Amino acid sequence: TQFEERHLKFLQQLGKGNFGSVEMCRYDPLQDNTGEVVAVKKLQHSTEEHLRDFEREIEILKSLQHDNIVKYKGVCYSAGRRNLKLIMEYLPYGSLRDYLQKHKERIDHIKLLQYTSQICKGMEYLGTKRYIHRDLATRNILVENENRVKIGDFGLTKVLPQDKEFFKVKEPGESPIFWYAPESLTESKFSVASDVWSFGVVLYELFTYIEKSKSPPAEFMRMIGNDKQGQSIVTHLIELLKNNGRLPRPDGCPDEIYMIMTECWNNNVNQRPSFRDLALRVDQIRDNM
Numbered sequence: 001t002q003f004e005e006r007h008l009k010f011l012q013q014l015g016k017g018n019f020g021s022v023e024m025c026r027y028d029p030l031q032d033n034t035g036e037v038v039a040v041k042k043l044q045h046s047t048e049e050h051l052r053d054f055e056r057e058i059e060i061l062k063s064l065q066h067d068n069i070v071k072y073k074g075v076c077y078s079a080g081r082r083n084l085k086l087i088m089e090y091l092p093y094g095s096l097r098d099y100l101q102k103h104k105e106r107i108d109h110i111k112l113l114q115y116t117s118q119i120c121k122g123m124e125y126l127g128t129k130r131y132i133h134r135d136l137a138t139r140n141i142l143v144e145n146e147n148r149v150k151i152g153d154f155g156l157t158k159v160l161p162q163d164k165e166f167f168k169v170k171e172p173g174e175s176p177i178f179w180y181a182p183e184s185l186t187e188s189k190f191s192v193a194s195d196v197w198s199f200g201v202v203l204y205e206l207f208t209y210i211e212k213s214k215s216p217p218a219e220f221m222r223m224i225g226n227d228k229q230g231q232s233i234v235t236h237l238i239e240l241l242k243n244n245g246r247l248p249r250p251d252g253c254p255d256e257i258y259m260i261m262t263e264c265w266n267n268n269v270n271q272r273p274s275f276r277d278l279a280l281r282v283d284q285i286r287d288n289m
């Protein structure tokens with residue numbers, strides 16, 4: 001879990017996450033090829049704040065061990081221990097968002113339901129730590145193989161206080177608003193229940209197959225008026241959601257699955273299902289058949 005900079009060998013640039021870039025590297029202490037391939041996260045701007053944030057992600061990630069959560073491996077104190085890099089497992093098939101677009105040939109509803117279940121279970125696990133993810137979306141889930149997805153992107157995750165069921169985030173500025181529960185948009189309140197709302201959007205994403213014009217931003221913007229810019233977008237999204245405006249049932253999506261979506265998208269926070277409810281329902285659906 002302490003990786004030496006001189007043995008971390010660059011292989012590929014991957015995405016460019018919030019703190020900075022992510023690379024695929026080979027860790028080869030024996031210097032001969034033959035090491036483990038890993039993902040290495042870097043911090044672009046190591047300010048007092050960005051570092052504190054990066055360090056918080058590391059603690060969080062180091063504290064989780066679950067089949068459907070990306071593996072923490074360690075840290076690398078490069079530049080003479082004057083820089084730090086997070087070392088994680090490398091999942092070869094990238095984000096669930098890209099996978100669904102690139103590998104339709106090997107995806108059916110059963111696979112979609114498997115992914116759905118796996119995400120729910122990772123989310124049950126986070127809840128036992130009182131962690132709120134706050135950023136659930138297929139772009140933030142990673143694919144190990146055709147049978148296995150893992151939740152990643154713990155850069156925005158927060159811990160609920162001892163006895164507070166919600167966390168108010170001082171000011172969400174430049175947010176993924178189209179995944180957010182109304183009370184997150186209106187009050188900056190995040191909770192297990194707001195994660196459930198977002199999971200609903202994730203379930204929608206799965207069944208739209210990240211198709212051309214059916215993404216949540218595209219759909220919401222169609223409903224609201226594609227003309228709209230800046231804050232009018234937010235104003236109209238809120239008003240829309242408050243009075244039961246919802247994303248449409250994807251083409252070929254079963255009614256039973258759309259109902260799961262609609263139950264997650266309850267304005268009434270308490271009435272949303274739990275992740276435990278959701279895992280059971282999805283697994284039962286799979287097991288019937």
Ligand SMILES: Cc1[nH]nc2[nH]c(=O)cc(-c3ccccc3)c12
Binds near residue numbers: 070090091092095
């Ligand atoms: C963190 C990670 N582990 N394995 C990965 N495979 C990828 O294709 C992409 C990432 C990644 C995750 C977050 C931000 C950028 C890239 C990734």
